[PDB]
Symmetry: C2
Subunit: 70 residues, 2 copies
């Protein structure tokens, strides 16, 4: 997964790039969930990454987007 | 991904359980690589997890299995 959030890139824009790469692999729902819990958080920028980790397990993409909106 | 390595479970056995769950989603090669770099390492037991992180990026499943063999 080459996609990494730019330090000034809006979270939603990063999410779209991330999912564009995810779609190319026709990932199932379970795979999407795993990728959202791991790589989406791990590849987020310094500011957003801290916030996302502080959400705990089971946080939805929506809750992540709400947390890092801007 | 419910699969987590037991504190006394051989790494290879954990790998097989992990991949059994991965097969159920018909994950592509790219998805397998992402899962191997993230969840396989993150869900490994205390002993093996440290060793695996110390391998750095691009470490193959084979190198991981060699590192935590026993």
């Amino acid at each position: 997964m080459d996609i990494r959030q730019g330090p000034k890139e809006p979270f939603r824009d990063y999410v779209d790039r991330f999912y564009k790469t995810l779609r190319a692999e026709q990932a199932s729902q379970e795979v999407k969930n795993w990728m959202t819990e791991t790589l989406l958080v791990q590849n987020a920028n310094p500011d957003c990454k801290t916030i996302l980790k502080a959400l705990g397990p089971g946080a939805t993409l929506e809750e992540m987007m709400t947390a890092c909106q801007g």
